[PDB]
């Protein structure tokens, strides 16, 4: 059934699973027309498909051409997401295919279920967790590859960089979700924290800076403070 706080350690067991987040598939800017009406302009989007155990991220870039001449784009986007995830699964060797796919938004359940009818043994699950994967486009290298794409494209990343050499998956996911929650609550402050110290760099083959274990503890503390800071600014506390 649904994934929640109670069954959270299941994310890090040895059954292959993927989270699918569709928030950033259909992205628009709303603007005024010459006549004073409102219109939208689509920009490139992405499906965020993540193995929480290994950090492997399958970033399917959604180019604005896929929406040309289509109607009801917010509904289409869910089915296009499901089409692309099903295509990804079919492209993987059998022993790499997931046993479960967890969708971060319940509106993806029926589209994914229908696209996966050929895979009756792959469980499609919702989650009660409020995960911050919408903030993936706040990671500069992911935003850059999405915006620069001129055609549909799949790009593969490890969203944990090399962290699993030193920490467990559970801890790596906790770090990722804290980073993304912070970037979602106050992007400017979060990026300031991550780069305030010019001596710490991001390796060419990495997404995040090369913090030592001790520096990650400081960074993680600064991110929590930020989240609590924003929480007080928001609610006046």
């Amino acid at each position: 059934g649904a994934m929640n706080s109670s069954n959270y350690a299941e994310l890090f067991n040895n059954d292959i699973k993927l989270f699918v987040d569709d928030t950033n598939v259909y992205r628009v800017t709303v603007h005024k027309t010459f006549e004073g009406n409102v219109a939208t302009k689509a920009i490139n989007g992405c499906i965020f498909t993540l193995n929480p155990k290994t950090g492997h991220l399958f970033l399917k870039i959604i180019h604005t051409s896929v929406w040309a001449g289509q109607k009801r784009l917010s509904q289409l986007a869910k089915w296009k997401t499901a089409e692309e995830v099903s295509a990804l699964v079919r492209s993987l060797p059998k022993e790499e295919q997931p046993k479960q796919i967890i969708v971060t938004r319940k509106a993806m359940l029926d589209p994914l279920e229908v696209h996966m009818l050929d895979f009756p043994n792959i469980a499609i699950r919702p989650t009660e967790l409020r995960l911050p994967f919408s903030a993936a486009m706040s990671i500069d290298k992911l935003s850059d590859v999405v915006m620069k794409a001129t055609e549909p494209q799949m790009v593969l990343f490890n969203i944990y960089d090399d962290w699993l050499d030193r920490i467990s998956s559970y801890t790596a996911f906790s770090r990722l979700t804290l980073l993304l929650r912070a970037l979602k609550t106050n992007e400017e402050s979060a990026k300031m924290i991550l780069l305030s110290d010019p001596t710490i760099t991001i390796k060419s083959y990495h997404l995040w800076p090369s913090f030592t274990d001790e520096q990650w503890i400081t960074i993680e503390s600064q991110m929590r403070d930020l989240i609590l800071t924003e929480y007080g600014r928001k609610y006046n506390v």
Partner: protein, 300 residues
């Protein structure tokens, strides 16, 4: 006009004949039902006074044989049987009639209700849904499960309705996933109408039979089937005009006949609200929407 004689009535029971119901007391001179209209299927059904558990009954067509009812004290129910000796049967019936120990089928001449509920129902199709080929009549009760219910357990006692499942490979063409899920016309017109039922008459017959089993026996899987067959039509953007008009008439008479006090259990809020107010056919069921709004406005 045909007759279903009863050998006797040893236990107190409410007897149904089509949409009529009446009580019989423990051991009264009740010997059966006469003046049954020829040309329709019929259902004779039972609810014991001492144990309302298990409504049960028999679908039959008097054109196919001479049928009677006889209580079986071992199995504890009123059983339908066929009498193969015609002269024996005519003599039994004529004697019970002469002694006026039969209730007369209460049909009002103006009243087309039963025709309207059974327009497309045919004994031969009932006997394929209810499999017991040694008898010309078909037993149904409150507890019998459907083939689909069993998939999700005795197959000889199942209701073999046509399986409808909107999230199935039968319903969804590879490559038309969104199209076929949001507009079920392919599944209705090619898979079900052309493929399985052959024509809309057979589809409506199964729909009507499913409703009647839901209503007369409280058969839950029958209610599921009735609603699935409605939903498949309403969720199709392309339906022949003659089917939509007939569907409106069918549902109108089903809603009209439904006991007001059973609406809570026999009517699925989601399906009806979807069909009348959100679906492709939200404007194609004028009579049904009007009677639903005036009779069950709570549900909506």
């Amino acid at each position: 006009m045909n007759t279903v004689p009863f050998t006797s009535a040893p236990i107190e029971v409410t007897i149904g004949i089509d949409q009529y119901s009446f009580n019989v007391k423990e051991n009264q001179p009740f010997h059966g039902i006469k003046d049954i209209p020829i040309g329709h299927v019929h259902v004779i059904h039972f609810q014991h006074a001492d144990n309302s558990s298990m409504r049960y009954g028999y679908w039959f067509d008097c054109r196919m044989g001479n049928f009677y009812i006889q209580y079986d004290p071992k199995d504890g129910l009123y059983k339908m049987m066929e009498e193969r000796d015609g002269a024996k049967f005519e003599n039994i019936v004529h004697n019970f009639k002469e002694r006026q120990m039969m209730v007369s089928y209460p049909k009002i001449d103006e009243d087309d209700t039963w025709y309207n509920l059974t327009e497309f129902v045919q004994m031969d199709k009932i006997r394929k849904i209810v499999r017991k080929d040694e008898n010309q009549f078909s037993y149904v009760d409150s507890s019998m499960t459907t083939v689909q219910e069993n998939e999700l357990s005795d197959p000889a006692h199942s209701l073999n309705y046509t399986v409808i499942n909107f999230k199935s490979r039968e319903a969804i063409r590879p490559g038309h996933e969104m199209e076929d899920f949001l507009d079920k016309s392919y599944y209705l017109n090619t898979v079900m109408l052309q493929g399985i039922f052959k024509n809309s008459s057979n589809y409506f017959g199964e729909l009507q039979f499913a409703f009647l089993n839901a209503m007369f026996f409280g058969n839950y899987g029958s209610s599921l089937q009735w609603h699935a067959m409605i939903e498949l039509i309403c969720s199709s953007a392309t339906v022949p005009k003659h089917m939509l008009d007939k569907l409106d008439e069918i549902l109108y008479y089903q809603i009209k006949t439904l006991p007001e006090q059973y609406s809570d259990i026999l009517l699925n809020e989601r399906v009806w609200n979807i069909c009348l107010y959100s679906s492709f056919q939200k404007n194609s069921l004028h009579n049904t929407e009007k009677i639903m709004e005036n009779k069950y406005p709570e549900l909506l």
